[PDB]
């Protein structure tokens, strides 16, 4: 039974449609899973991944991601701020460096050297809610 994609939670249904655009045309699983999750990182209303993501307690939106292909090539970024698409920066760690995981400032520094630019990932909604949590 191939191609076939599985993803977590309800946003995974809509993510699965983007991934299937690659898979149904006989494309690589790697490009498919990357396209699939990017949809959710891109969505401001998807508050648990990328751009809509709720911040840490100090109000900084830090993102974590990793990717792994069919032949043990892997890439990860963790606690990276300002890059809406951590899965692609992770993909670039994998394909473009001798390393496999970059975290914090160094992850952003690498992202920017690869042409990703800084965006504001804290939506007004998430700043509002963080400031409600700060009272509670």
């Amino acid at each position: 039974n191939k191609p076939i994609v599985l993803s977590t939670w309800n946003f995974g249904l809509h993510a699965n449609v983007e991934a299937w655009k690659v898979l149904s045309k006989g494309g690589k699983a790697l490009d498919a899973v990357e396209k699939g999750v990017r949809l959710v990182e891109d969505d401001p209303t998807e508050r648990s991944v990328g751009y809509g993501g709720r911040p840490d307690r100090d109000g900084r939106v830090t993102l974590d991601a990793c990717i792994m292909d069919e032949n043990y090539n892997i890439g990860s970024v963790a606690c990276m701020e300002h890059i809406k698409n951590p899965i692609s920066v992770a993909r670039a760690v994998m394909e473009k460096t001798p390393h496999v995981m970059l975290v914090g400032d160094g992850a952003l520094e690498f992202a920017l050297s690869q042409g990703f630019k800084k965006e504001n990932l804290l939506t007004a909604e998430s700043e509002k809610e963080w400031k409600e949590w700060l009272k509670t």
């Binding site: 076939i4 994609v5 599985l6 977590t8 792994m68």
Partner: protein, 139 residues
């Protein structure tokens, strides 16, 4: 968090995992999503799995590497996910923790395009899209 794994028309596996983490977490906190034996593991000879649940607990059990080795040992994706979660429950019990406070779940896929999923607690769903179309199933 969204975790995604796939088998393409060549029969190759790959996966991706992405999150903003625990809301209002300590600064610099990292969960299971960028850790290869924990949030995501893929072996194109056996299968792939991604995790859901509390990041800390998935790190602690290196759950997704466990799921893929259980498929290596001869379990289907469904059996691997279930047996993985059942070991994790025994560990939560060994640590004297209340199971209601812990949630860990996995979705798994093997080379044949067989898939499965299982969780400590109810309330998680996952989407499956093959040639029978896109559907949301419940572990």
């Amino acid at each position: 968090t969204i975790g995604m794994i796939a088998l393409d028309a060549q029969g190759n596996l790959s996966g991706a995992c992405t999150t903003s983490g625990m809301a209002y977490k300590m600064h610099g906190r990292v969960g299971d999503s960028p850790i290869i034996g924990a949030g995501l593991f893929v072996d194109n000879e056996i299968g792939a799995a991604t995790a859901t649940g509390h990041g800390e607990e998935v790190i602690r059990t290196v759950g997704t590497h466990l799921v893929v080795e259980l498929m290596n040992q001869g379990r289907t994706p469904q059996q691997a996910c279930k047996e993985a979660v059942e070991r994790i429950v025994k560990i939560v019990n060994r640590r004297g923790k209340n199971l209601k406070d812990i949630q860990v779940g996995f979705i798994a896929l093997n080379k044949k395009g067989e898939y499965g999923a299982y969780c400590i607690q109810d309330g998680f769903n996952f989407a499956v899209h093959d040639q029978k179309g896109n559907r949301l199933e419940t572990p």
